[PDB]
Design a protein around this nucleic acid. Structure first.
Ligand SMILES: CC(=O)[C@H]1O[C@@H](OC2=CCC(/C=C(\C)C(=O)N[C@@H]3[C@H](O)[C@@H](O)[C@H]4OCO[C@H]4[C@@H]3O)=CC2=O)[C@@H](O)[C@@H]1O
Ligand SMILES: [Mg+2]
Ligand SMILES: [Mg+2]
Ligand SMILES: [Mg+2]
Ligand SMILES: [Mg+2]
Ligand SMILES: [Mg+2]
Ligand SMILES: [Mg+2]
Ligand SMILES: [Mg+2]
Ligand SMILES: [Mg+2]
Ligand SMILES: [Mg+2]
Ligand SMILES: [Mg+2]
Ligand SMILES: [Mg+2]
Ligand SMILES: [Mg+2]
Ligand SMILES: [Mg+2]
Ligand SMILES: [Mg+2]
Ligand SMILES: [Mg+2]
Ligand SMILES: [Mg+2]
Ligand SMILES: [Mg+2]
Ligand SMILES: [Mg+2]
Ligand SMILES: [Mg+2]
Ligand SMILES: [Mg+2]
Ligand SMILES: [Mg+2]
Ligand SMILES: [Mg+2]
Ligand SMILES: [Mg+2]
Ligand SMILES: [Mg+2]
Ligand SMILES: [Mg+2]
Ligand SMILES: [Mg+2]
Ligand SMILES: [Mg+2]
Ligand SMILES: [Mg+2]
Ligand SMILES: [Mg+2]
Ligand SMILES: [Mg+2]
Lengths: 55, 104, 136, 175
RNA sequence: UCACAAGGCUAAAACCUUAUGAAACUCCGAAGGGGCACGCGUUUAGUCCGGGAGUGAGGCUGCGAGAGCUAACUUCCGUAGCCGAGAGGGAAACAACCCAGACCAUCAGCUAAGGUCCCUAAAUGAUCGCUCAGUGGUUAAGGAUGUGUCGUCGCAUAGACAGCCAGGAGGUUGGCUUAGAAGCAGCCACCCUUCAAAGAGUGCGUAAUAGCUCACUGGUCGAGUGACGAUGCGCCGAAAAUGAUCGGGGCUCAAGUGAUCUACCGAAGCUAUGGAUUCAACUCGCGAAGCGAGUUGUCUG
RNA sequence: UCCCAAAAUGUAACGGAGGCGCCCAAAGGUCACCUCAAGACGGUUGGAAAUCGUCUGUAGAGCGCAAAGGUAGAAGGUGG
RNA sequence: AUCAACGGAUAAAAGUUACCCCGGGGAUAACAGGCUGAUCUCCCCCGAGAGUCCAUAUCGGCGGGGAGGUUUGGCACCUC
RNA sequence: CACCCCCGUGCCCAUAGCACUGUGGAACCACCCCACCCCAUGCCGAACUGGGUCGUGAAACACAGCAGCGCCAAUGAUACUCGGACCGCAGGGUCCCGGAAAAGUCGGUCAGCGCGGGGGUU
């Protein structure tokens, strides 16, 4: 799937941060692609509301 | 009541001791002494008495206890642990013992 | 009113009312709307109220009951040294839960005796009639 | 009666005013949803011994007695119904409201007509000829007489699941 | 197990139907939470050994509970974030709140929360509506033919709710009660005579009478009315001390509020360009390391 | 020891109950054996309860003391 | 070894100061204000009876809803 | 285990339990018989136990019938809830998206799998 960061990290839980980190997004505006597999897509369920996502 | 039988049955720590369970049924005038690996749900010896005993009654003890221990020594089963059930260990089943206690 | 013997003390919490939201014992029944507390006298109130109205004498079912010890410290001390002695007793009435059932009177008597009853309480209230049939 | 839907998602209804649903034949069981209006109408018309027909928006009329209702305890309206699709000859253990008949002589000396069991769990007439109510004459009762489940009547071909000595409608003293 | 609502029944205890409360009840019992493994797919940290510390007064909101009075800018734990140690926009003003983490430069562009009549950047925008109260712009039980929406119930082309017309009757001062109550101060009961219709009746009344109106009944008129709930938004209830007000101006010919769409403004976050440092990898020279340099990626409250 | 303690351990309060500073020479080791509280009927003193008897009987008892967890195939009761 | 103030200062120990001194604290009380509103103050609803009769001319049980911030307090936030 | 069936024994720890009930005797079980000593009773062959039958199928045990009780238990729906958002001064409540019982109803069931032995199928 296709990821973009639009809402920041500040004021948000330890885990949701650490997922935004260990997804690879380091600042808003950031874009990315992702292996449509469980674990790493369930790393985009978890922090969904921070990412506008494509398909 | 049952109590005694299930009591000894558990003081034969089922398989964990390693050895071989040795049943009995001296509550009738037809007995049944058996040999079990209990873990494996199988029986490995078998000295009955219902296919003609001898003629004796509680003298038969040492005899089916000699027949059992014989079928044992034949099988290869060289080690004992003595189950019972509702039994005192003193007379009849004690004979079965003594003559199994040196009989295979 | 009060109870007989017990534990002594308490605390508090809320979220909707278990049972029994159904019209047993009576034809007509009055039902809470707010997550109140209710007191010994607060109910003995409605006892004596409705029991005025019905005359001799109706049939009146107080489906609620005070079991909660509520305290107040001695007036005028700074906190600490204890928990308050038991001030009064409370039935923890939650909403939809039904407090009063009566029959042996008519519709008008239910309306009015329940009106006068509910003008004695910390809650808006609705009166109604049976049909809640999961178990009579 | 008549439904249209049967999914798991209820936005097809609710606001548009329909009730969550089940109805089992006992070899056939089906979830669905039925408009509030009609259900309330008929269910007070016909109630827990009512029996009525299910012409699903497909074309397959069915035979339905009402089994369990489950409602919004706060708003005090119903949100769900369990059905029992009737069979043929043998039915179930019908629940039926005891009534009272006649100007009783029990209420002339200060007493009161009290139904110590508003509803009665019988057994089987046959699922097409069911008693809706019951009629327990009370006139003979004075003050202090109860009516056990023996004295309760019958319409023929029915049995009483209830202990024949426990108290249904008994007169109470004044005050 | 302690509690407890009605009723059965017996001599009440038990026990049956009906029925409910629990931090120190538990036939049952999630959501989550934790250990281990795997890494099946991402990301960067971890752990040890040795040097230097400081801190050990915490504070607020949100969710959990306790002590309190379901008081506190209250206190004592837990838990997330924030300030502490956080600038920038917003919330008029405002450590904590909503957006957001400021390496320098720019008279450059897009957005977030939050906004777009003037103060004050940006639609006095578009369409379907609501409220008329300045509600908006500070509270409640309780009360209201306010005004829109859905739904129940009843009534009449067999004459309706209301307007006016006439009976609103004899038993019977019903009995009880009483100084007298005779429709009407309190206690059990509501039966008959006829009728186009009329009930020991409902109010004002009399110390008690009598006496005046309705429940029903018929003439008229010409048609809808009447009640019991749900609900959107408003009204009353709404009284404190120096000068008033929503930040103000002012707005209802919305600048109020419910819905749906789209355009623009807005930050030190994102973006353009230019440059600097931090780390790292690459290339080069002297002599592995090592320095400066250069390029790329990176980092800097 | 028990709640409070937010289903992992942990966690404060001058929050909510209660207990210890011993006891045991057998109440320990082993071996063997026994089963409990109650209710119903029926029974000399008794007769609410004592003793015996039978039917019921997974814990509604017992564990030296506090409760929770635990326990009937014994940790409970009796002897070598 | 009630070193039980129970990680235990000496082998060994009590008061008083309004004669009082120094060092600090708004880390902490009395004053005021503040936030809170239990108590205090007042107003509203329901009406059970009182008023020969008649709840409401006046009066208003048992109970409910609020105001106000003048009481005694709680809290210890600016000032020791 | 060749077919039934009984004796001993296990995996399974009530969809495998209990009561009501019918079958069951030389073929195993059981009762029964006696016990001066082995051996045993806090007294008693009741029990542990030594001698051995007939006798009985009664009791106990085994089998089968059986849904009255217990046991088990759906789907639907709900409570609560992770995480997204929000309203009310507040007691508390809502919306989106997932996880999701308890109890009740439909029902389901007289368990199911082994090893060895004895004993029968003119
Ligand atoms: C001059 C000082 O000491 C300094 O301390 C600070 O002031 C004050 C200190 C104490 C105080 C009041 C005390 C002790 C009191 O107990 N006061 C009660 C009562 O409340 C009061 O109202 C009176 O009423 C009946 O008699 C009185 C009665 O003794 C008032 C002050 O203002 C500071 O501002 C000053 O400079
Ligand atoms: Mg169950
Ligand atoms: Mg310290
Ligand atoms: Mg802290
Ligand atoms: Mg503090
Ligand atoms: Mg600091
Ligand atoms: Mg700032
Ligand atoms: Mg700011
Ligand atoms: Mg500003
Ligand atoms: Mg602040
Ligand atoms: Mg926007
Ligand atoms: Mg402008
Ligand atoms: Mg560079
Ligand atoms: Mg720095
Ligand atoms: Mg936890
Ligand atoms: Mg702590
Ligand atoms: Mg210490
Ligand atoms: Mg010393
Ligand atoms: Mg002096
Ligand atoms: Mg001097
Ligand atoms: Mg000084
Ligand atoms: Mg003072
Ligand atoms: Mg002060
Ligand atoms: Mg007061
Ligand atoms: Mg009066
Ligand atoms: Mg003060
Ligand atoms: Mg301070
Ligand atoms: Mg949430
Ligand atoms: Mg859901
Ligand atoms: Mg699910
Ligand atoms: Mg059977």
């Amino acid at each position: 799937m296709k990821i973009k960061l639009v809402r920041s990290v500040i004021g948000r839980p330890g885990n949701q941060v650490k997922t935004v980190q260990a997804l690879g997004l380091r600042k808003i505006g950031d874009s990315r692609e992702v292996s449509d597999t469980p674990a790493v897509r369930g790393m985009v369920k978890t922090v969904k509301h921070l990412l506008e996502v494509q398909e | 009541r049952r109590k005694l039988r299930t009591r000894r049955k558990v003081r034969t720590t089922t398989a964990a001791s390693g050895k071989l369970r040795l049943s009995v049924y001296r509550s009738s005038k037809h007995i049944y002494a058996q040999i079990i690996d209990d873990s494996r749900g199988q029986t490995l010896a078998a000295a009955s008495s219902a296919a003609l005993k001898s003629g004796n009654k509680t003298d038969t003890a040492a005899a089916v206890g000699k027949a059992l221990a014989a079928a044992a020594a034949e099988k290869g089963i060289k080690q004992v642990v003595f189950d019972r059930g509702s039994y005192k260990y003193h007379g009849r089943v004690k004979a079965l013992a003594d003559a199994a206690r040196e009989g295979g | 009113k009060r109870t007989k013997f017990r534990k002594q003390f308490r605390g508090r919490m809320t979220g909707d009312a278990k049972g029994g939201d159904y019209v047993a014992f009576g034809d007509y029944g009055l039902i809470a709307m707010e997550p109140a507390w209710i007191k010994s006298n607060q109910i003995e109130a409605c006892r004596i109220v409705m029991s005025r109205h019905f005359r001799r004498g109706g049939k009146i079912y107080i489906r609620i009951f005070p079991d909660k010890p509520v305290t107040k410290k001695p007036a005028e001390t700074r906190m600490g040294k204890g928990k308050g002695a038991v001030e009064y007793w409370v039935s923890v009435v939650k909403p939809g839960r039904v407090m009063f059932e009566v029959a042996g009177v008519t519709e008008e008597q239910a309306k009015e005796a329940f009106r006068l009853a509910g003008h004695k309480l910390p809650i808006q209230t609705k009166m109604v009639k049976r049909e809640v049939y999961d178990e009579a | 009666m008549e439904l249209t839907a049967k999914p798991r998602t209820p936005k097809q209804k609710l606001d548009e005013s329909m009730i969550a649903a089940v109805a089992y034949n006992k070899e056939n069981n089906v979830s669905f949803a039925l408009d509030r209006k009609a259900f309330d109408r008929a269910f007070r018309q016909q109630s827990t011994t009512g029996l009525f027909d299910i012409t699903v928006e497909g074309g397959e009329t069915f035979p339905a007695l009402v089994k369990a209702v489950q409602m919004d305890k706060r708003k005090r309206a119903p949100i769900h119904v369990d059905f029992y699709m009737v069979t043929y000859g043998e039915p179930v253990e019908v629940s039926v409201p005891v009534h009272t008949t006649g100007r009783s002589q029990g209420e002339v000396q200060g007493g009161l007509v009290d139904i110590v069991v508003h509803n009665l769990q019988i057994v089987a007439p046959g699922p097409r000829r069911i008693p809706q109510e019951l009629v327990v004459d009370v006139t003979k009762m004075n003050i202090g007489d109860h009516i056990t489940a023996g004295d309760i009547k019958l319409p023929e071909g029915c049995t009483l699941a209830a202990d024949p000595e426990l108290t249904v409608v008994s007169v109470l003293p004044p005050r």
